């Protein structure tokens, strides 16, 4: 069973929370967002997120860094920092993952996600978890790699 919890989408780009919070890997992310018809976002286009209000508390997976989008300065989310914050070092590859959707409305789109529309076949039981706790199921897998199995 997994559980895959989404935000708003701010300019196209929403983050994706597996189950336990920091755990996927990059080649977990690519696939993932590969499922909702997405991409792992550029900085670009996590840059514009963030300026139409897209911040979490949460390190997650672009291509190429992991970064966590702040507009609001927090303690316990990035120390403070503000901006698109590049994470440096960390001993460890599992975060959360960011996916960026091209056909998205351009600003905060908070209505529900109702479907994984390019998972394969597979026998996961496999549920996207909306903020508003809406939810929708479907039977398949989404990861192409065995050792992420």
Same mark, same amino acid.
């Given at each position: 069973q997994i559980d895959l919890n989404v935000t708003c989408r701010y300019a196209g780009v929403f983050h994706? %929370?597996?189950?336990?919070?920091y755990s996927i890997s990059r080649t977990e992310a690519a696939d993932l967002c590969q499922a909702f018809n997405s991409t792992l976002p550029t900085m670009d286009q996590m840059k514009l997120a963030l300026s139409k209000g897209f911040e979490?508390?949460?390190?997650?997976?672009? %291509?190429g860094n992991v970064v966590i989008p702040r507009i609001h300065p927090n303690a316990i989310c990035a120390a403070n920092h503000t901006g698109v914050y590049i994470l440096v070092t960390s001993n460890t590859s599992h975060y959360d993952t960011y996916c960026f959707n091209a056909s998205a409305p351009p600003e905060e789109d908070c209505t529900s996600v109702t479907d994984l529309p390019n998972s394969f076949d597979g026998p996961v039981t496999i549920t996207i978890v909306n903020r508003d706790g809406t939810r929708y199921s479907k039977k398949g897998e989404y990861r192409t790699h065995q050792e992420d199995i």
């Open positions: 994706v %929370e597996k189950n336990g919070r979490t508390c949460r390190y997650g997976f672009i %291509e």
